Amino acid sequence: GWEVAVRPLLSASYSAFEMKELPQLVASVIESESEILHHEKQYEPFYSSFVALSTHYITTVQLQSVAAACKVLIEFSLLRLENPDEACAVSQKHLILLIKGLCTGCSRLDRTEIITFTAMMKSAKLPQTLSRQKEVQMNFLNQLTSVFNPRTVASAIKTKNVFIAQNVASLQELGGSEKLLRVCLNLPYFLRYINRFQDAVLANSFFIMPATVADATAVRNGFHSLVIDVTMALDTLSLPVLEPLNPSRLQDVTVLSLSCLYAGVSVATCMAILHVGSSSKEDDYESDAATIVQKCLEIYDMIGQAISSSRRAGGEHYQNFQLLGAWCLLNSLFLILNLSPTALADKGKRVRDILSRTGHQGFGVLSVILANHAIKLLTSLFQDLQVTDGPPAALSIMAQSTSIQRIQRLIDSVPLMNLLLTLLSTSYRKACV
Amino acid sequence: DAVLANSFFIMPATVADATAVRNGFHSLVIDVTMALDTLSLPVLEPLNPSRLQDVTVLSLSCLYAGVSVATCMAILHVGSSSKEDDYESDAATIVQKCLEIYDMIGQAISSSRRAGGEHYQNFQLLGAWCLLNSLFLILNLSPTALADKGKRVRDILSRTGHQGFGVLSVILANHAIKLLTSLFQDLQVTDGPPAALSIMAQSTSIQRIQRLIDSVPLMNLLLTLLSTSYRKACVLQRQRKSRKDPELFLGLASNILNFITSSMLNSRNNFIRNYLSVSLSEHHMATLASIIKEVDKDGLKGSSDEEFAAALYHFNHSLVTSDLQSPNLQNTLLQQLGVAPFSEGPWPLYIHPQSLSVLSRLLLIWQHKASAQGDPDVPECLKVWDRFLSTMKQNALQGVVPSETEDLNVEHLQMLLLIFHN
C-alpha cells in the first residue's frame, strides 16, 4: 500500500530522518515509477508533496539505488516544470530550488513550506485521505547489473561529491539543459523585455519607456513578480546546464542575459524617474529595485564568465558580449542623465528623437553601480584596442569585427567624452553636497 | 611535410644514423632553452591569424624535435661511461623543455582574447596526433630483425621483444593520454571527412576523433602500451628484490586503463561504442588474462599495486557488464583464464579472487538474462556443477589431502551455491 510507503516521511516530519527509513523509501520510489509520471488531476498534489518531502529528506544526507531514485525525482520535476498544471502542490519556483538542492548541499527549502507540505500531505486523499529478503535481492540485482564508478571522479565530503556527480550526470542524461533554457526563455514577464531588446537591436536605437510618473507607477506595483522571476532565472543559470554552446544555444544565452540586463536598466530608469518626480511601501520598492538590479548584474557576469571559459565560444564572442553590454549600459546612462527636472517630465504627459531635438536631481546608487559596470566594460574594450572608416561593428554575438570597429560603433551610438565628463561632474557634486 | 602528406616522418634510421643525429645534442639543448626563455616573455598577446599560424608552427615543431630525440634514444637503447650519461641527461632535458614549451603555448592560446575554444581544440588535436604517431612508431621498433635489415607509418601499415620503452616513453604516453581524455570528454557532451590538421579549421569532436582513428588504430596501441608498461614494472620489481623505480610505469598503466574505462566503456555516444565493439580482438583478451594471472599470482605488494588492482578490477567489470564483447570473446577470456565452463579437465577448485570475480559476474549475468527472458537453465551452469561434482568425487575416491592454496576457498563455494539457487 501507499500509506505504509508514506509512513516514514510522516514519522520523520517531527524529527530528523532515521537511517533505517531510507532504503525502503528508495524501494518505494523505484517500484511506483511506472505510475508516478502518469496521474489524474486529483491525486496530483498528493504526489507532488510526497516528491517534495522525499527529495528534501534525501538531500539532507546503496548508492546506485539512491542515484536511481534521484534520477526519477529529477525526471518528475523536469516534466512538472515543462507542463506545470494549475493544481500542482509545489509551484515552479520551488521545483527549481528543489532541482538545484539535489545538485547541491540542501540549503534551499525552509520549514515554513514543509509545514504546509505536510498539512497538504494529511489533507490529500490516497491513490489506492491521510487525515527483508526482497529488498536485499533487488539491491543485489542493481549492484550486479551496473558498476558504480567509484574512483573515476573526509568521508562526508567525498560521499557528497560522488552524490553530486551522480545527480548532475542523471540530470544531463535527461537533457534537462535544453528544457530549462526553453522554460527560462519563454517567461510570461521577461517576454516584453526580450521583445523590446529585439526591436532595439533591429532598429539600432535604444528604447526605455517608464514614460511619465503615472506610467512609472504603472510599471511599478508589479515589481515583486519581477523579483521572483529574476531569482528563479539566476538559480536556473547557476546549474551546470550551459556546456554545449552551439551557435543557436549561444544566441539564446546572449538573448536571455542581455534582456535581463535590459530589465535591470529599465527598473533603474523607473526608479530615477520616480525620484525626479517627487512610508514602508516606498522602502520596499527601493529595496526591491536594488535587489533586481543586483541580480541582473550577477546574471550578466555569470553568463559572460561562462562564455569566456567555454571550449566552443572564444575571444571574439566574449568581445561581442562585452560590446553589447557596454552599448546598453552607456545608452541607459545617457538617457537617465538627460532626464529633465520638470520641463520634459511635465510636457510629456528614445535616444534618436532626443539627439534630433538637441537640474541633475536624478542619479543615485543604481546610477553609480551601472556606471561602474559600464566603465569596467569600457576599460576592457580600450585595453583590447590599444594592442578605413568602415561600418560600425554589428551588434550580434556571431559577428566578426576589430576593436576599432567596436569603439567606433560605441562613439556613433553616443557622444562618449561629453557623457563621461557629465557623470564625473554630477557624481562629484552629489558627493560634495 | 608530415602535415602536407597526412603521414608521420621520423628518421633516426639505423644505429649509425642515430649516432649521427646524436653528438649535436648540446646545440639542440641551447636552442630549446633560448626558445623557452623567449617564449616566456609577454610577446604573444596580439594573436592575428598569421601570428597564430607562426606560433603553432613553432610549438609543434619543437614538440616534433622532442619526439625525434626520444625516438633516437629508444633506437640507441634497442641497438645496445660519462658520455652516455651526458647523452641521456641531455635527452631528458630537451624532451622536458619541449613539453614545457608546448604547454605554455597551449595555455597562451586558450586564455587569449583573440584565439578561442576552436583553436585550442585544433592545437590539442595536432599535439595528440603527433604524440600517438610517435608512440606507435617507437613501440613498433624491432629488436634485431628490422633494425639490422634496415642497414614512416604508411609503409609499416602497408607491410603489416619489447625491449624499447623507457622514461621518455612514459612521459610521452602521459601527455598523449591527457590530450586524449580532454578530446573524448569534449566529444561526450554522417561518416564525413577527417578533421583538417590546421589551427584555423572548423570541425566537430567526432571529426577529430575519427581523424585520430584513421591515422592510427587506437585501441590496439593503448593495450600494447598498457601491457608493455606493466611488464616492465613487474620485471623491475622482481629485479629490485626515475628509471630505477617501477611505480612510474605502474602509474602509467593505471592511468591508461582508467582512461579506457571512463572515456570509452562508459561513453553514451553510439559511434564510439560501435568502434569499440568492432576493434576488440581475442589477442587483447589473452593479454588481459595474462595481466590478471600476474596480478593474482604476485599478490598485494604496495600502494601503487593497490591502485593498479582497483583500476584493473574496474576495467574488467565495466567491460563485462556493458554488453560490447561478443559471447565468443567472453568464452575466449574464460578459456585463457583456465576456468572455461566447457573445459574437459578437472575443475580448478581454487580460483584467485580476480578470476573468481569476473567469472561470477559473467555467469550471474547469463543466469539473470535467461531467467528474465524465460530461457530454461543455462547449460554452462549445469556443466560447471557437473564438473565440480565429478572432480570432487574423484578427489574423495583418491583420499587426497590438498594444500592450503589448492582446493575450495570459501568464496568459490558461496558463488556455486548462489548459482544453484537460481
Author numbering:
A (entry chain B): 28 to 88, 96 to 162, 166 to 168, 185 to 206, 230 to 354, 364 to 434, 443 to 451, 465 to 493, ...
B (entry chain A): 275 to 354, 364 to 434, 443 to 451, 465 to 493, 502 to 553, 640 to 820
Can you list sentences taken from the study reporting this PDB entry?
Among the >600 human ubiquitin ligases, UBR4 plays a particularly important PQC role, being an essential and conserved E3/E4 ligase found across eukaryotes. Aside from teaming up with various ubiquitin ligases, UBR4 activity is linked to two specific cofactors: calcium-binding protein calmodulin (CALM1) and KCMF1 (13, 16, 17, 20, 21). Our data show that the evolutionarily conserved UBR4 complex forms a megadalton E4 arena, in which inward-facing ZZ-DZB domains of KCMF1 act not as E3 ligases but as substrate receptors. The architecture of the E4 megacomplex is conserved across eukaryotes, but species-specific adaptations allow UBR4 to perform its precisely tuned quality-control function in diverse cellular environments.
